[PDB]
Symmetry: D2
Subunit: 366 residues, 4 copies
């Protein structure tokens, strides 16, 4: 059994815990051993280690990564801690499952990437929207020739978790200790999807805005320093075009990662708010010609491991169980885990190049 | 910790196993101890015990049910075995989580109901479409007067798992194993939902059909004895009207449990194939008047235990985690499990009453 | 060129006026001449005759039906006047485009059916939801075997216009309530898909008993919703409902045909989409959204490019054209007063069934 | 009554003819007199004159624009004839209803705009997607504060009429006698809508592609000179951001002019393939929060002239009737029509500006 350490218990932390708990239930083999859970404060770590099924909890993440009973470390902490935690786990000889984005800067991601290549350990980054059966089905349909050659990509990622101007300021909204805004939180997810469909990015031209520039801060206010929304025109290395956007102030949207690939022989379209649906157009005889609604079921990758009947909606959290299985397989020397820290660094360059472009008014080439 | 025995490992067996594994992760407390898994043959039971995380496996279900390390039994076997397994578990002093429908006949269900009442143990039946955040939010909305007084119910449950006439004669067919056809497999679910929204059923007038009358059975052909579809007009105890249907041959549908409640001051509409959407109409100013798409999120019951952010789709399997929690709380005495075997018996009477009506061409009163 | 009389200028009167005005624009041949428009009061009839392009307006409907320049009479008045006006038009030697439902009772419709046969003139009833390109495409798909054998029909017609005074609420002017105003439409579609009805078991309700803003007593005299189970003459099953109090819905005439080899589904609120399921390879399996376009009957007379949405009013231009071709002996219009009589028997049989709590066989 | 001349009888000629015939039926006043129809050859003009209800047909469009019984001229011919015909009509003292785009080039458009200015006759260009009740309702909602201040526009116009590579080459696909491709045929429509919602365009950065570069050309093949698709980032005069695309090779789309306006207090979204629906999000209480589907009815501008009952779908052709009415009222001195040749020249500058941006890889400021 794989020995597991988990750092953090929040949105992604609990998602990781659920994932590691059921990965063998879904996919077979030996259940991973849930060894050490790290979180703060300590009594929360202890309480949650009990209910999560971990052998023990600790408030010291360094203890978790060095434990001799641990083979792999899930890292779900705030972005500013990612570099230090991943580098320590790799230095301790542990495989790493790091939540996105890799870190605050390209410089940090470059160091992480060299550290991963220096260890002989597997890494995967938590781009969970690449794990849905519908997304994986789309990739396989394209690889099967279902839509011919992609000629255009249009993608967006809209949410409104910051749309309320009275939500408080935080150091996450500074460049120095928050890194990127919408591009860092949501943009990187869209890039992960985008490059899986279209291949590498060659050029971006971007624009960005801070829509709510000031927020409540301990009686007065403080300045929001990173972007609430951004958009970019893409030229892929292949020569094909792309449209790209993200926003954390797009009112009414909650997880609207939506993309489409228009090809020479068809079109694929997806919206994460309805993650069980994949829309596929292929030319057909005029009397019946039209897009097909493909409802997620056992014909799509991964789904059969959770349910034998179609239309029993696959959930957001189950994307994480798939992601866990990919890592287990990679550790065991079968499949590859995508993206590792090398593949991840590329994604980091793209989002930071979009930010640089928006700042400078000039395109950025890769 | 509650000691768990699980009988069966198919569609629902694995779903229960996943639910028991993650119930404390989601809702806190102590994780249940996964003690014994029973399945046949023995080889498979030991293999699945290992991957599901159960302390041992056996091919002898009777032994599992009377293991003193077990407190509660999940029963996920075909319908013809429910009665015998449930009565034995209850006789051994074990709580029971029973898959729907209760058994083959109303008489079977009355027996099971009596055994449950005599045992003084908690029961819950696997009507998991009553556990979605959207459904539970709908019930609360109705109670709050969001749509006024209900004036009409229209419900359906379409799937196509038997639509292909080449599918071999399996279990769900005939009177052994399955009992009723679409009414037993799907209709029962629709009733569980319907009565939760509208209250008890006073009268039904029904019709039914067998659309595919024969199937391949190991080189011969065997007759299909139960119904592929059925429809009924309803009068509820309230006086309100209802329409009701189910089908296992409705081509293109996979899990189309869909319902709407029309009221004096609005309308609620839902489709399980998009189980994260609840449609609500309430009167508004003419310029902005229309149905609202309510996307599932932490405002709805149960969701916040799985994810803090709205629009991260809740899945089919997570309904079963919610059901596990309701059973835990009921066992601990902090809540009511619905439906228990008594509540379940009423559901059985409704579906069998519709069968009677379809056979006689006469309405059936309750 | 057909000479046209139009009686009534409301919802349907204006729709007929626009249909007659553009039938030749869309389908060729000679533009119909708009001869006489009848409505009350007279000054309204004069005004609308001018703007609609009719040679005259009159407050006397008999004046419209007796005009020698008229070949065909559109009757778009309240239901209580349909019988008298249609019988007079037919006696006068005019073809008749009659709004649904036929009249107030089965007896009325029987008298009208006999009159139509005696007159040797074409009739058509205004069941305009049978005229969409999507609907006509569906009928043809079913005839071609695209969904195999129909095994179940489920239809509904929800609107909410009564949930918030109309002659529709009286038995002398409207007749039946929801069954008469909306039910008949769903019947026209249902029988066109499934064939004739053999049996109904029905139920009904009045939810709003009195119009609360009328001041004086304003008793709603007929049903607000009804539902039925159907057996078709084929033996196949059906579900049927209608409502004028289903809040949020405005023209939700929605139906599906579940076949042994596929399913077709439609909702009039998105009248340009027809959903077709047929089994396919596991990897691509699912319903197709067929967007209305020139491959569908009638569309190409209005637009050569797919996806430019066909409108409700354009259904009426198609209806007019069907009448025009029937008059010229080039096709049969559906439904004539004989086909329409059967539809009346169905909705009135549903009403009887709901009153008695008993099934009604046809 | 207004005396009408109509030049051309194709897609738009028939659409204009239907509009002229029903404009007084819908909106009152006097029916326009259908005086002269022009098309080639003569047999075709005489036949269509008869069926469209025009007093006469001719093969000589000059005679048509010169007739003293004509007050207004509908020009629905191919793009390379617009300028000559429009200048001739204005010089003959006639009002003009001109199909989009204005001409092949900005220079032609400047010249036509100069002619119009000196004419004292009314002009309107055929931007019919600005005439839907939904679009007009959206514009009014934004003015009323329904979504607060706009903070992002995203628009697209996908069709697939050129997607098949075996469709034969033609001179419209030459820059000389075709002008722009997808920008000229579809892009201009999207600009018309975009500027009406967001205000004037201040800056664009664009890219464009020809996807199918060569098409069967009697015997051999030949070259396509203008673009199949184009995308742009926008800054409006308000400072607000935008995304913009068009394509004539986007498979499965037929008339997918779709746009979205995200504001500080809400979101509006529309797709012309479902032209009777307008989606409006405004913040709501957590239990009922979500987008409203506004179905087109008499509450929206123009609808009541065609039907008194909501939900009876307004069609594409009826947009043209509304456009006819606006011109009618402008001729009567009872309201300015939009867009006239001055307003339209700005739209032409935008689309040609995007083409210039795409060719240079440089932003273009207006
Ligand atoms: N892949 C996705 O879909 C996705 C979704 C949401 C968030 N995220 C990512 O997950 C990470 C955390 O986001 P969240 O929304 O889960 O945040 P959160 O605040 O919900 O959770 C952060 C967790 O880290 C813990 N933590 C903080 N400092 C710590 C320390 N020094 N030692 C141990 N634990 C510590 C917190 O107590 C908490 O349990 C971020 O990188 C974020 O981008 C990814
Ligand atoms: N609530 C729901 O959503 C839902 C969904 C699917 C099925 N079900 C119900 O679950 C039950 C089983 O359905 P399924 O689809 O999981 O069937 P299945 O055929 O997938 O699984 C049946 C399981 O029972 C086992 N079994 C049979 N006889 C046994 C015995 N004597 N001892 C031990 N194990 C035995 C089989 O090996 C198998 O593991 C049925 O009652 C059905 O109505 C419920
Ligand atoms: N096919 C459809 O989709 C559709 C839609 C609406 C109405 N209808 C039907 O069309 C008919 C008319 O309905 P409506 O909604 O247009 O009603 P309406 O009230 O809008 O119009 C009725 C018209 O009849 C006129 N009228 C009344 N008494 C008259 C008389 N003695 N002489 C001349 N004119 C008279 C009224 O002034 C008015 O112009 C009804 O039978 C109704 O069922 C059909
Ligand atoms: N607003 C819209 O939604 C919309 C839709 C389609 C086309 N258009 C525009 O309408 C115009 C026409 O496009 P179409 O699709 O109708 O093309 P088309 O080829 O269908 O029609 C052009 C018409 O002009 C006629 N014509 C050509 N040369 C002529 C001459 N010398 N004299 C008289 N008539 C002549 C043709 O015979 C034909 O009847 C274009 O400018 C196009 O951009 C607008
Ligand atoms: O309980 C069930 C449904 O959930 C499920 O959707 C069906 O496919 C199964 O056959 C049925 O047993
Ligand atoms: O014909 C009719 C329907 O088309 C229409 O939808 C209803 O609103 C009308 O009341 C009815 O008379
Ligand atoms: O104006 C146009 C669009 O409305 C229409 O949708 C396209 O098909 C036409 O090519 C274009 O001329």
């Amino acid at each position: 059994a794989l020995g597991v350490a988990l750092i953090g218990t929040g949105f992604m932390g609990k998602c990781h815990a659920m994932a590691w708990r059921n990965v063998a239930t879904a996919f077979g083999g030996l259940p991973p051993r849930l060894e050490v859970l790290a979180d703060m404060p300590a009594d929360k770590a202890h309480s949650l280690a009990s209910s999560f099924g971990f052998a023990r909890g600790t408030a010291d993440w360094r203890e978790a990564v060095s434990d001799p009973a641990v083979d792999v470390v899930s890292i779900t902490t705030p972005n500013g801690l990612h570099r230090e935690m991943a580098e320590a786990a790799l230095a301790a000889g542990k495989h790493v499952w790091l939540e996105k984005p890799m870190a605050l800067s390209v410089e940090d991601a470059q160091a992480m990437e060299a550290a991963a290549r220096a260890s002989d350990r597997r890494t995967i980054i938590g781009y969970n929207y690449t794990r849905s059966p519908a997304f994986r089905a789309a990739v396989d349909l394209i690889a099967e020739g279902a839509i011919g050659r992609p000629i255009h990509f249009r993608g967006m990622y809209d949410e409104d978790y910051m749309a309320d101007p009275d939500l408080p300021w935080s150091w996450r909204l500074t460049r120095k200790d928050g890194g990127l805004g919408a591009l860092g939180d949501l943009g990187c997810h869209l890039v992960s999807v985008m490059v899986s469909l279209m291949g590498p990015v060659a050029r971006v031209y971007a624009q960005a805005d801070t829509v709510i520039t000031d927020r409540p801060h301990q009686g007065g206010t403080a300045r929001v320093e990173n972007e609430d929304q951004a958009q970019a025109l893409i030229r892929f290395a292949s020569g094909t075009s792309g449209e790209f956007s993200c926003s954390r102030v797009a009112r009414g949207y909650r997880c609207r990662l939506a993309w489409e690939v228009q090809g020479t022989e068809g079109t694929l379209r997806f919206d994460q708010e309805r993650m069980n649906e994949l829309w596929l157009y292929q030319p057909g005889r005029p009397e019946i010609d039209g897009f097909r609604r493909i409802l997620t079921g056992p014909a799509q990758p991964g789904f059969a491991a959770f349910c034998p009947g179609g239309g029993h909606n696959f959930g957001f959290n189950e994307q994480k169980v798939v992601e866990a299985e990919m890592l287990r397989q990679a550790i065991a020397g079968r499949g590859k885990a995508w993206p590792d820290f090398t593949d991840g660094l590329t994604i980091e360059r793209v989002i930071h190049g979009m930010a640089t472009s928006a700042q400078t008014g000039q395109p950025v080439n890769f």
